[PDB]
Amino acid sequence: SLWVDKYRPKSLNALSHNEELTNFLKSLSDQPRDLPHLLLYGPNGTGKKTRCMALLESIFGPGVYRLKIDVRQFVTASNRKLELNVVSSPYHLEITPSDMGNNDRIVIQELLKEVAQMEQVDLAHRYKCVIINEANSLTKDAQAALRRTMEKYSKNIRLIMVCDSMSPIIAPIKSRCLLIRCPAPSDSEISTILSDVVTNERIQLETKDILKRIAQASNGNLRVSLLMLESMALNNELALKSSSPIIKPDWIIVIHKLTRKIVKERSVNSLIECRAVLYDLLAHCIPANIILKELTFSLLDVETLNTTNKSSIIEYSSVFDERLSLGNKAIFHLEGFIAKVMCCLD
Amino acid sequence: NKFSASTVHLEHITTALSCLTPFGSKDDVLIFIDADGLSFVRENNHVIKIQLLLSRELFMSYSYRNETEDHMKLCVKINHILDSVSVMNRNDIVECTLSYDGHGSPFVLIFEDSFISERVEYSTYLIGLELDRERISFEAIIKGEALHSALKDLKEIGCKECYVYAKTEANDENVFALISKSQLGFSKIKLPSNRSILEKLQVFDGDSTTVIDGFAVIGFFDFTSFDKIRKSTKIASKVLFRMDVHGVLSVNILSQPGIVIEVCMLEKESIDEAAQTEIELLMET
Amino acid sequence: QQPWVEKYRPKNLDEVTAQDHAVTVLKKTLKSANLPHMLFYGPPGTGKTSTILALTKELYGPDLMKSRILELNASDERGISIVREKVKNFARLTVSKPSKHDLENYPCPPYKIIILDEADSMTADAQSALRRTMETYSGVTRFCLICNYVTRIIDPLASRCSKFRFKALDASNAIDRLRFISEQENVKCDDGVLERILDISAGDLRRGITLLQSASKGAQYLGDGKNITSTQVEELAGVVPHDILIEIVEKVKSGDFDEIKKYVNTFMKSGWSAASVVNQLHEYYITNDNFDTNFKNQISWLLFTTDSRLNNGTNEHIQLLNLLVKISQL
Amino acid sequence: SKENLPWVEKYRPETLDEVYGQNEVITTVRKFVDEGKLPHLLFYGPPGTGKTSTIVALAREIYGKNYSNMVLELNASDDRGIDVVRNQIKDFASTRQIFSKGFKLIILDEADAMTNAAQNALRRVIERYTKNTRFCVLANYAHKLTPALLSRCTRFRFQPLPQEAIERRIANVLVHEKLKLSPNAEKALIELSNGDMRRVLNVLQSCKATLDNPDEDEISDDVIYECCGAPRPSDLKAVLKSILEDDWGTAHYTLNKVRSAKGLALIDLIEGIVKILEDYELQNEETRVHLLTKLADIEYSISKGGNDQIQGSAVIGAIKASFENETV
Amino acid sequence: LSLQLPWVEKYRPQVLSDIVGNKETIDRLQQIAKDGNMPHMIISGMPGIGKTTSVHCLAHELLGRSYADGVLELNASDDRGIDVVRNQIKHFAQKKLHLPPGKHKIVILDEADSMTAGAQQALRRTMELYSNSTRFAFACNQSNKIIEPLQSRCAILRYSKLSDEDVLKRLLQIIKLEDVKYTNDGLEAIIFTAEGDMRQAINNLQSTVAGHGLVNADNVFKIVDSPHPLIVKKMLLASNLEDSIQILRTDLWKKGYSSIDIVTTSFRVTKNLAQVKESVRLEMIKEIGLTHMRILEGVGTYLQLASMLAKIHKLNNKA
Amino acid sequence: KKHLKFICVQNMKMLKEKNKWNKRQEVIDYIAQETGDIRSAITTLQFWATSSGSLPISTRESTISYFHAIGKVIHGSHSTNNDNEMINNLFENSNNLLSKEDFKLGILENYNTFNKGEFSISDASSIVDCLSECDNMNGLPESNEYGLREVRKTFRNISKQGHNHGTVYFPREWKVRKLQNSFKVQAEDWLNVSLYKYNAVHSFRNITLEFGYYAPLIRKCQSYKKIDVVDRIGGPIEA
DNA sequence: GATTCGTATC
Numbered sequence A: 001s002l003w004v005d006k007y008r009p010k011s012l013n014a015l016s017h018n019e020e021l022t023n024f025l026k027s028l029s030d031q032p033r034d035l036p037h038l039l040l041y042g043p044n045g046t047g048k049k050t051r052c053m054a055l056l057e058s059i060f061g062p063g064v065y066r067l068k069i070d071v072r073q074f075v076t077a078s079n080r081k082l083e084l085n086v087v088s089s090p091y092h093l094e095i096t097p098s099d100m101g102n103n104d105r106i107v108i109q110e111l112l113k114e115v116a117q118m119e120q121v122d123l124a125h126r127y128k129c130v131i132i133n134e135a136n137s138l139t140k141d142a143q144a145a146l147r148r149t150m151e152k153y154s155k156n157i158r159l160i161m162v163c164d165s166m167s168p169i170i171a172p173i174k175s176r177c178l179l180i181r182c183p184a185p186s187d188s189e190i191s192t193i194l195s196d197v198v199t200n201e202r203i204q205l206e207t208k209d210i211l212k213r214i215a216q217a218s219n220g221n222l223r224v225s226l227l228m229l230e231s232m233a234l235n236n237e238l239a240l241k242s243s244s245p246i247i248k249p250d251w252i253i254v255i256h257k258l259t260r261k262i263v264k265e266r267s268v269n270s271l272i273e274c275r276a277v278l279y280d281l282l283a284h285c286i287p288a289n290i291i292l293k294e295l296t297f298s299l300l301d302v303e304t305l306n307t308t309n310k311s312s313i314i315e316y317s318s319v320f321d322e323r324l325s326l327g328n329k330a331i332f333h334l335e336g337f338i339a340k341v342m343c344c345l346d
Numbered sequence B: 001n002k003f004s005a006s007t008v009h010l011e012h013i014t015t016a017l018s019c020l021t022p023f024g025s026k027d028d029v030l031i032f033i034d035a036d037g038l039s040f041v042r043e044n045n046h047v048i049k050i051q052l053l054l055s056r057e058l059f060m061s062y063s064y065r066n067e068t069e070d071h072m073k074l075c076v077k078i079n080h081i082l083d084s085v086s087v088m089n090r091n092d093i094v095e096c097t098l099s100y101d102g103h104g105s106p107f108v109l110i111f112e113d114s115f116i117s118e119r120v121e122y123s124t125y126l127i128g129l130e131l132d133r134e135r136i137s138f139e140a141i142i143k144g145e146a147l148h149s150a151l152k153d154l155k156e157i158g159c160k161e162c163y164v165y166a167k168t169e170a171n172d173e174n175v176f177a178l179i180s181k182s183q184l185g186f187s188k189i190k191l192p193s194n195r196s197i198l199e200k201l202q203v204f205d206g207d208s209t210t211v212i213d214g215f216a217v218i219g220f221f222d223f224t225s226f227d228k229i230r231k232s233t234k235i236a237s238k239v240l241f242r243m244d245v246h247g248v249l250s251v252n253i254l255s256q257p258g259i260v261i262e263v264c265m266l267e268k269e270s271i272d273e274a275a276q277t278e279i280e281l282l283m284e285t
Numbered sequence C: 001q002q003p004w005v006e007k008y009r010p011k012n013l014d015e016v017t018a019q020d021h022a023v024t025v026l027k028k029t030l031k032s033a034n035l036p037h038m039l040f041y042g043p044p045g046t047g048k049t050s051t052i053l054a055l056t057k058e059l060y061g062p063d064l065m066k067s068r069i070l071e072l073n074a075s076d077e078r079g080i081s082i083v084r085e086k087v088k089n090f091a092r093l094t095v096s097k098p099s100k101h102d103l104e105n106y107p108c109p110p111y112k113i114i115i116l117d118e119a120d121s122m123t124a125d126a127q128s129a130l131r132r133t134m135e136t137y138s139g140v141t142r143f144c145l146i147c148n149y150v151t152r153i154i155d156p157l158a159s160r161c162s163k164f165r166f167k168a169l170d171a172s173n174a175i176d177r178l179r180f181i182s183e184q185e186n187v188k189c190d191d192g193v194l195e196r197i198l199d200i201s202a203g204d205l206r207r208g209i210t211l212l213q214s215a216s217k218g219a220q221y222l223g224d225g226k227n228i229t230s231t232q233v234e235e236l237a238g239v240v241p242h243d244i245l246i247e248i249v250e251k252v253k254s255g256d257f258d259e260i261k262k263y264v265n266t267f268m269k270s271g272w273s274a275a276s277v278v279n280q281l282h283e284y285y286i287t288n289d290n291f292d293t294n295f296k297n298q299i300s301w302l303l304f305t306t307d308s309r310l311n312n313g314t315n316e317h318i319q320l321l322n323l324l325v326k327i328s329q330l
Numbered sequence D: 001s002k003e004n005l006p007w008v009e010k011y012r013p014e015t016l017d018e019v020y021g022q023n024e025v026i027t028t029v030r031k032f033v034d035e036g037k038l039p040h041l042l043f044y045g046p047p048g049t050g051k052t053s054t055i056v057a058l059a060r061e062i063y064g065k066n067y068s069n070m071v072l073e074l075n076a077s078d079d080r081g082i083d084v085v086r087n088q089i090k091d092f093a094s095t096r097q098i099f100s101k102g103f104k105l106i107i108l109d110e111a112d113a114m115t116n117a118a119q120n121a122l123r124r125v126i127e128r129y130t131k132n133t134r135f136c137v138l139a140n141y142a143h144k145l146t147p148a149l150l151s152r153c154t155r156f157r158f159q160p161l162p163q164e165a166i167e168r169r170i171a172n173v174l175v176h177e178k179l180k181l182s183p184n185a186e187k188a189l190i191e192l193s194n195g196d197m198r199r200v201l202n203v204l205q206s207c208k209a210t211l212d213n214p215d216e217d218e219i220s221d222d223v224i225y226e227c228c229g230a231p232r233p234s235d236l237k238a239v240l241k242s243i244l245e246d247d248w249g250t251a252h253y254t255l256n257k258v259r260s261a262k263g264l265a266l267i268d269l270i271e272g273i274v275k276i277l278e279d280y281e282l283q284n285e286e287t288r289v290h291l292l293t294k295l296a297d298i299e300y301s302i303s304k305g306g307n308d309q310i311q312g313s314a315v316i317g318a319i320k321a322s323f324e325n326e327t328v
Numbered sequence E: 001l002s003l004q005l006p007w008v009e010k011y012r013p014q015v016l017s018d019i020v021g022n023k024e025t026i027d028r029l030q031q032i033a034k035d036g037n038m039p040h041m042i043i044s045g046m047p048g049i050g051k052t053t054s055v056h057c058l059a060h061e062l063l064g065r066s067y068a069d070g071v072l073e074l075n076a077s078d079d080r081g082i083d084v085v086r087n088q089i090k091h092f093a094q095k096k097l098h099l100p101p102g103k104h105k106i107v108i109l110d111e112a113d114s115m116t117a118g119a120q121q122a123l124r125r126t127m128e129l130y131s132n133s134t135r136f137a138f139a140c141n142q143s144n145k146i147i148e149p150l151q152s153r154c155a156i157l158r159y160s161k162l163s164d165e166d167v168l169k170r171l172l173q174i175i176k177l178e179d180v181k182y183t184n185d186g187l188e189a190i191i192f193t194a195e196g197d198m199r200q201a202i203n204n205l206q207s208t209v210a211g212h213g214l215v216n217a218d219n220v221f222k223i224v225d226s227p228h229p230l231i232v233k234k235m236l237l238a239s240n241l242e243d244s245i246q247i248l249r250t251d252l253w254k255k256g257y258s259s260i261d262i263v264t265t266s267f268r269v270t271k272n273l274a275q276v277k278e279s280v281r282l283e284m285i286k287e288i289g290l291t292h293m294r295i296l297e298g299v300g301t302y303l304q305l306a307s308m309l310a311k312i313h314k315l316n317n318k319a
Numbered sequence F: 001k002k003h004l005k006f007i008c009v010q011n012m013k014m015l016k017e018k019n020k021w022n023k024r025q026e027v028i029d030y031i032a033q034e035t036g037d038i039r040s041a042i043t044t045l046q047f048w049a050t051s052s053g054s055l056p057i058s059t060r061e062s063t064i065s066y067f068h069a070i071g072k073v074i075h076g077s078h079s080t081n082n083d084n085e086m087i088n089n090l091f092e093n094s095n096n097l098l099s100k101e102d103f104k105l106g107i108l109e110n111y112n113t114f115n116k117g118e119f120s121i122s123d124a125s126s127i128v129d130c131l132s133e134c135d136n137m138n139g140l141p142e143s144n145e146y147g148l149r150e151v152r153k154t155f156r157n158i159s160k161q162g163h164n165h166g167t168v169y170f171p172r173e174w175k176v177r178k179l180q181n182s183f184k185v186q187a188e189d190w191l192n193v194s195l196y197k198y199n200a201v202h203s204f205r206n207i208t209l210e211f212g213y214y215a216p217l218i219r220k221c222q223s224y225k226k227i228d229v230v231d232r233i234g235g236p237i238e239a
Numbered sequence G: 001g002a003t004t005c006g007t008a009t010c
């Protein structure tokens, strides 16, 4: 197993990076009966899902981690077959409605209204939680069913949905949930976690600075930092030195190369080459929102650009991110952003 | 109970409710209730109306313990009844009891097999084509089997539109024919003058008093509407025709007190009357 | 037992607070029998579902209710076909008879109510279908449409339905209800709290009740037996501390792009909500006496644009950085 | 049981003499009835202006008793696809008339909800069976009607109700319900109606419900605004004066205080300020462009929801900024 | 309640000599009537300019006493699926009917623009197999909706919009045959509001006669409304913003016109609008599209329309 | 032209009878230029010959192809110096082709074929900006009209003589969709392997971001020091 | 509609 999963804290006492959030979770889990609906929001990779699973273990005891996966079939208006995977353990349910596209409304209706009405009497009645990963990916139609589903059937079901940047979450849903903020760990805590991992894994470490380098390069991403740690562990024969290169994902390198090309050569042919690169990126299912975000924040790291160019770049990035939110085809807005940048740089 | 009626011959209710089947299969059926009996009136497109009556002597028990209103009117969905009364008979008394407890109460249909009582309650919903009896253009009395065969042939052919011929003669050579207009075109289906099939055919000249000979009566009917009477003719013994001047065709079916069926039909406007001349010339030829 | 929002939901029209206009009209309708077609609209958590459920109960009682009410919400299909068949069939239905107990104890008006909650999620085709169904059966059936955005209701339906706007529940409106809930659940609050709760929860009593419940759970888990302070309330309500906001303002004041970029990177690593920090920046800048009218006009438009862009489910980091950079050049 | 109905479908006109406002349409249709010739009508106008009432009253006047079997009425609540038009409408307008004689009527309420295929089929039914059947097409949006369908129909436009028609209907309702109404309340009701009678009847019903004793107490403009939840004209004038003249802090404070005094919405204030400013004589012309564009953007954003304080300060800033060109 | 045919159908021409407008096309149709060698033809144009009447008059003048079983008029109101086409059309074309020497059967297909494509392919087969005995006459509003394989076999006749002189002449004929009192300005107003439509002109004249009697400008304009596309064009071309706003308000908003109708008419007017630069025209189209989106999402107030006019004036006034 | 001349020289008597033989050549040239349909040309010629008046010669209108419409939008149309009327006729006659997302994709893919990409970057930015704005109108007719008009105006203001244009191509979007489908299949396989082998549930976004690169790297290092999925998800990236 | 290459003809 990966080091992200091998050393996942299985208890509320095993979480050792936020503490105050752990105290709040313990306050919530002291009396599970009056548990409200929760909304965990924070940067990607901080550990929100681990906190949800730790809270569930605190409430329902060990056994929430025995996940059974089954495929359940759906039917749309046009009568096509859709197969959603429902990672189901006892005492709780996991659903990723974003596995289907705009067709997640039928899931949020059928699958969730099925369990909301179905009680859990076995003379004693318990409430079974339901976890909704990536609550942002719901299409404002699943959320509209969600709000009344959880308002009226609160006696039998509890909703714990995880997300980052909960702005695309509608006001009725946000008003119906307890907002739990999960901040990202500081570099010291990431380095401490990596130190514990390497100690339990018998990796030879030259100096502790190469863990602070991993923490800084991951930008507060525990999973990303642990994956980097395992990568350089298995690419250096389990002996890491300060000469060991900081390794970054291929698409990040491609975006940085695209930034270099955009800054260097600014012509229509350069625009066409950038379009080819963007199409290659989209062929790897990298969402266009994060493509634009990484492109913007790599173009703002170039030192040859003055303040006027950077301000223009950030303004165009905001405009075209709003356009991308309301759009249907990503390539139009990505190409428009790149063209505007290449027209403003010169 | 405001109205209660029990019977053991559920075959009457089955055949009766099948007599409304040629009409809308998914719609509402209007039911009158009165001491004389209850009737199932159905209407389609404001152009045709069936009216099937079950008299009080049909039921072994018929109470109508109400006096505030002469009749009780309730409207229910037809296929709720059709889906529910699919009991496959039994063999068990299978006694059927019809109940109604005034406004705001469901129409109840109780079926008892001497142990099992599958009681079904039907939700009631929120709530014309009569010929003027003083004026009848023609009146014919035919046997049921001949008419059933005529409609069966007319359906075999398709018959996009149909015509009715009625011309009595001085020598009592009464002629009654069903002229169609289909893929083949004009097909003349004339019923015989024999008293075995046609027992009476009088064609009037208005006011339904003067028996005038040598003149013909033409009725241009849409065949989709004329087909609604076909299933009723299957159980009929004698079928009575009565067409007025306002273009209303009334069919008087009685399966001999048995059941009585009242089918009233509105007749097409006959945009072009050249076809009328064509039909009469086809007849005299 | 239950979350305080569902535990303290109003059961009768007397418990519904601060919406006196609609509630008096409905209470007067109780003794009459000419209830119109109602359009309930207002901000989230203002007491619309509570009002309709309380009225329906007061009308029919627990028994007749199951037979004289049809509720459709966004969790069930409400297409054009469904509106044309199921709603029309229920409107066509005759009024079920009351019992003796219902006739004596409850008013039992001679009609049925169709409640269409989350009506803003219905397409214009379904509402066009509903037009004549509402009209031609107005003597046997009453329609209630509940939504947050009236503009999603087509003009014909808005004309047919009587409009009942639900006001936002500020501190003054809902302070008594929050005090009632706090006292009955034995909540020890410092003075100033229960007003900060309603100021943070702008026009939302559900959010205020959940905030109070979470603060109570924390203060009970502590076991320390001390009151709840405003600082705790702001902490678990997602409000950015004043010191972080002051640092943001001071880094904006020295309009260096790289400093602002680095600070925004760390701040968005801290996991805050961009809408909340944008709101706090609005309060700080628009209420400050250190800025002139021109700066305030420009900052108001910039904040409006940023809020509108954030409402579209955009990237919080990019929007916040662009807003702060624009402020730095004002 | 007409006392068990909402005021809107309790004062629905039963005769053509009770349809106020549309003098010309009513006179022309009465002349059509008297002369015995009725063309294929098309009633078009805003909602709640008297289209369905007029057509039903006209059909009742033409067929006093045969109305059940002489008029086929269809609306958006009934399926009206290609098959319905082909079968039901054609078979109704293809058969001879009931009783002695006449022409059959086919009323199509809300015909803009019909598909183009249904209208294309309907056009030849209209042109072919016109000898004994006449059509009435009721529509709020004429762009959803095929140009051929508009061609083969006689167009009658229902204007929004003028002041006099609403005043007469209000007087009738007040006499019927033994209600009183102050002249200022009458003006407030006229302005909030915006040419709709359903709005007037709904507001009046809510005003009767608001009153403690509707047999003695009158209805003033205060009751009108309290029940309908709208800003008083004085409040709108005060907010606009604070925005235009006073500084930023006091303008924001005045806006918030006025809003919180009666729980007013910002969209109502926006519409009131726009109505007030439309009478303003601007001298820079760019003052109007900026006002209209900015306020339309703010209204759209409000319609999508969001931060109320941000939107209110945006309104104040948009107004003050635009009026900077006025002095230029 | 009584018996009186409307003037539109009471005065529908029965002979080709009574049809006004496209003189060359009607003369050609008369030639076809006299010689009798009618080709497959497609008739297209605006509504109400004498397309159906021309087809039916040609059929009557070509078939005479054999019209009863010589034409097969199928229309949109009738079912015209692939099976209907196959069965009915094939059986009609296979019907051997003796006609005059230079005569053929005629298959009138009115509203052929609303026919399914597979039915058009079946029509292709029938057209190319039974052409020696029967001929096809398509009546349509736009010839694009008829597939190219069918237009290949037809002689395309395009009916132009009726000129004011032809409609005036037909109006005068109907007037001097119905005995209505009129004024020259009244007939001018009827012509102006008809906008090249004969059916609309007849309907408006009959409405004015029924409602007020004498047909002058005042009665016509008090019963009929000036074409709102012209008002939309007037408001879009206004010099200053105040005049455009006033026109919009007092001529479209107070008159009871839907905002969606105003926006759609504005788009249609902008598409066909000279004396404006291409950049200005496309900018106006963009602003109209944005306002149309706002109307479609529910924000259909007068403020949105005023803002659209303000943006249009910004773009066209260099403001 | 040759075949219409043959039909005329076989109908000289009638053609000479109606004195139309002194005009037949110009009408034959006009018919030949108007259509590329032999049957329609002969039908129109027969209609003109058998007639006795000044009827205009009208032939069936032939549809405009995909690349034909793209070229008409980019480079304009000969004999029509009015962009407005050309775009109007393009929309009336070929609205089925113009009202699609594929047409905007084709414009985006082929606007760089004007003078082999040798034009100002400001014009390209304007074109792509207008296309992105049109993408925010959800298939309204105004969106397509505005986009095509803006593209045509932009290319008209920069068009001069001496231009050597390229060759247009169909958009590669379907290739990207097939690649995304292959990625979805590979990610589903990796997730399936990633549960029964070791209990772990990972979201698809993480698979696209990190687990599509780092997990295959780990498995390849494990492969070298030795799990079904050893190669990178979606294949390697290039440039 | 554009480019390129190849024909055919005048």
Ligand SMILES: Nc1ncnc2c1ncn2[C@@H]1O[C@H](COP(=O)(O)OP(=O)(O)OP(O)(O)=S)[C@@H](O)[C@H]1O
Pocket: A172, A175, C004, C005, C006, C007, C008, C009, C010, C015, C016, C017, C018, C019, C042, C043, C044, C045, C046, C047, C048, C049, C050, C051, C147, C148, C169, C177, C205, C206, C209
């Ligand atoms: N006026 C009020 N009086 C009392 N409780 C209220 C009031 N308004 C809201 N609440 C409380 O708010 C919670 C939910 O309010 P609801 O009225 O059911 O929801 P809502 O107003 O429909 O908001 P939506 O559905 O998201 S638009 C319940 O706990 C209610 O007790």
Ligand SMILES: Nc1ncnc2c1ncn2[C@@H]1O[C@H](COP(=O)(O)OP(=O)(O)OP(O)(O)=S)[C@@H](O)[C@H]1O
Pocket: C156, C159, D007, D008, D009, D010, D011, D012, D013, D018, D019, D020, D021, D022, D046, D047, D048, D049, D050, D051, D052, D053, D054, D139, D140, D169, D197, D198, D201
């Ligand atoms: N001219 C009028 N005179 C009197 N009451 C009117 C008039 N117009 C409307 N009303 C009132 O408005 C109510 C509903 O208006 P209707 O005319 O039935 O609806 P409508 O005019 O068809 O508008 P739409 O298009 O159907 S939303 C009626 O019951 C009357 O009370």
Ligand SMILES: Nc1ncnc2c1ncn2[C@@H]1O[C@H](COP(=O)(O)OP(=O)(O)OP(O)(O)=S)[C@@H](O)[C@H]1O
Pocket: D148, D151, E007, E008, E009, E011, E012, E013, E018, E019, E020, E021, E046, E047, E048, E049, E050, E051, E052, E053, E054, E140, E141, E170, E198, E199, E202
């Ligand atoms: N040129 C004309 N001369 C005389 N009457 C005409 C003329 N054009 C139309 N009409 C009148 O218009 C009515 C019939 O018009 P039609 O020819 O049926 O319309 P159309 O041209 O078929 O348009 P569409 O596409 O069928 S709506 C009759 O009342 C005719 O008198």
Ligand SMILES: Nc1ncnc2c1ncn2[C@@H]1O[C@H](COP(=O)(O)OP(=O)(O)O)[C@@H](O)[C@H]1O
Pocket: A003, A004, A005, A007, A008, A009, A014, A015, A016, A017, A018, A043, A044, A045, A046, A047, A048, A049, A050, A051, A162, A193, A222, A223
């Ligand atoms: N307190 C902690 N101690 C050790 N590891 C942690 C802690 N919190 C999170 N992690 C690690 O972070 C990894 C990814 O976190 P995850 O829960 O996936 O974040 P998210 O919920 O944002 O997806 C997990 O594999 C887990 O092992």
Ligand SMILES: [Mg+2]
Pocket: C048, C049, C117
């Ligand atoms: Mg609700």
Ligand SMILES: [Mg+2]
Pocket: D051, D052, D109, D110, D138
């Ligand atoms: Mg209506």
Ligand SMILES: [Mg+2]
Pocket: E051, E052, E053, E110
């Ligand atoms: Mg026609």
